[PDB]
Symmetry: D2
Subunit: 163 residues, 4 copies
């Protein structure tokens, strides 16, 4: 199932993500440079998110170009964000013009891939299945990807012969 | 290679399409109803196109909802369009929420698929390789797909094990 | 649909191959050196075949290592083969140790691929859908592939998302 | 990378399996009826194994048709197997006549799939990368699969576009 995900918007999946589902976020541009304008916020941050029916952010994926890092986290609806889990940003992107972030669902954790190469395993923190995805950025900034992304949801059986 | 193709725009491929290349046009919405407003033009038409370096339209794919048909054609740069080749529109789309148009290149013709089911073989008319793709509609109308499409270019070797 | 195809045997398909079906013959070995022994025919020949319900060989694909070329033909049941259609063997295989022959069906012709690169388009000569495949060799010789091949039958939709 | 795996034999891989590698064991047949004969062991057992460079069985996957379950274990070279880990056999196969067992590698564990549906996560016990695979059966019995299996080694990137 394909979805069009515009910058600063949220899109509903067609159904809750089943066990071992796979979500691919596809860009047609790469920009690893700091945003021209920092904007009111004061922090260079663009992110994609997996959200449940209640509005909780099961997985938050932030790209911090001025900090050279990927920030993973979870955010209960209307509450503060938990402890951050970070890893270096350099050396993950930069190999192709259409960068992508792939998420592989497992019972207790999320497998995260950059341009199809696993870079981290994030332990789940909040309850409930993914039913929405969002693409957000702090006011006045410019993203590290195209301002519109292609999002595909599929299962291993799909990318293998048969129906 | 993934590309983001916005309504009423043209995007350059990263390189001329090689023999037996495959181009997939992906929408996340389907609307088989006549456009609300016909607009100045007076014809309900939305189309996608394969274009060469010189600006000639090697393959034109128009969807005519009020005529219940698919119109295939070619258009030399700055010249009149040739003879139309048409087939019924009903029964091709309507099986899924994310409709797609796939084009399979062959030496002398283009294999055209709707939602991955072949519906026609169009004989090539103009010379030169595909290097651009466009998504167009007549002024004031609303498309039968999302106003942004995902376009992927690949080769058979890609969708099969190995590198 | 996967099938095991042993040298000098014929295997039935699950059902008649439908329009645009794809058949992939996989080997885990490549040996382009000519067969040491030639047996009673005096001609180095190993072939794979697509057969219809009444015994007609719809498409015969031979590998002639002593003549540097592929040989394509059709053979009505109980009759003699028709005219041969050839292309060079050199420059097709070579870039892998697990070679494959892929046939992509079309209304009036067969698209043939070596290691997933199209090398020829064979115009159909007989009627009826393919219902069996075979792997044969001339008496007393050794083949250029493993003595057992993996055969997969699928369709374009199977290698693309959802449904 | 494709490999032919005959019953009661061991086959080497092209190179040590890298992080996140995927190994697919394919059969063209399914027979869950118990083996008519049991031979000297008196236990109906057919298995597939992932082996390292020094003879250690990193992962042993057994099918016990008389005990209704899969048996997972590890076996250091020259030593005795460790504790068994089981799950029911019933309800895993069944929806195809060409069954497959897929192993997806992870840093600390193996994700196991039957017909492309995850059924278990086995925690690694031994060191070293997988360099060989084998297909074995207890003396005098007949297996639940074809006597020859097709084995494919690949990576996630291989089943996704470009590079």
């Amino acid at each position: 199932m394909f979805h069009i995900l515009r910058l600063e918007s949220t899109v509903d999946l067609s159904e809750p993500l089943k066990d071992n589902g796979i979500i691919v976020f596809q860009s047609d541009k790469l920009d690893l440079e700091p945003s021209p304008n920092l904007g009111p916020t004061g922090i260079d941050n663009t992110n994609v998110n997996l959200i449940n029916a209640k509005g909780d952010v099961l997985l938050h994926i932030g790209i911090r170009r001025r900090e050279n890092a990927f920030v993973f986290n979870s955010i209960p609806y209307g509450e503060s964000r938990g402890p951050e889990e970070r890893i270096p940003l350099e050396g993950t992107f930069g190999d192709r013009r259409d960068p992508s972030i792939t998420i592989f669902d497992h019972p207790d954790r999320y497998q995260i891939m950059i341009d199809y190469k696993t870079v981290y395993y994030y332990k789940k923190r909040l309850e409930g299945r993914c039913e929405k995805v969002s693409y957000k950025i702090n006011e006045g900034q410019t993203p590290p990807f195209s301002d519109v992304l292609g999002v595909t949801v599929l299962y291993f059986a799909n990318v293998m012969p048969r129906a």
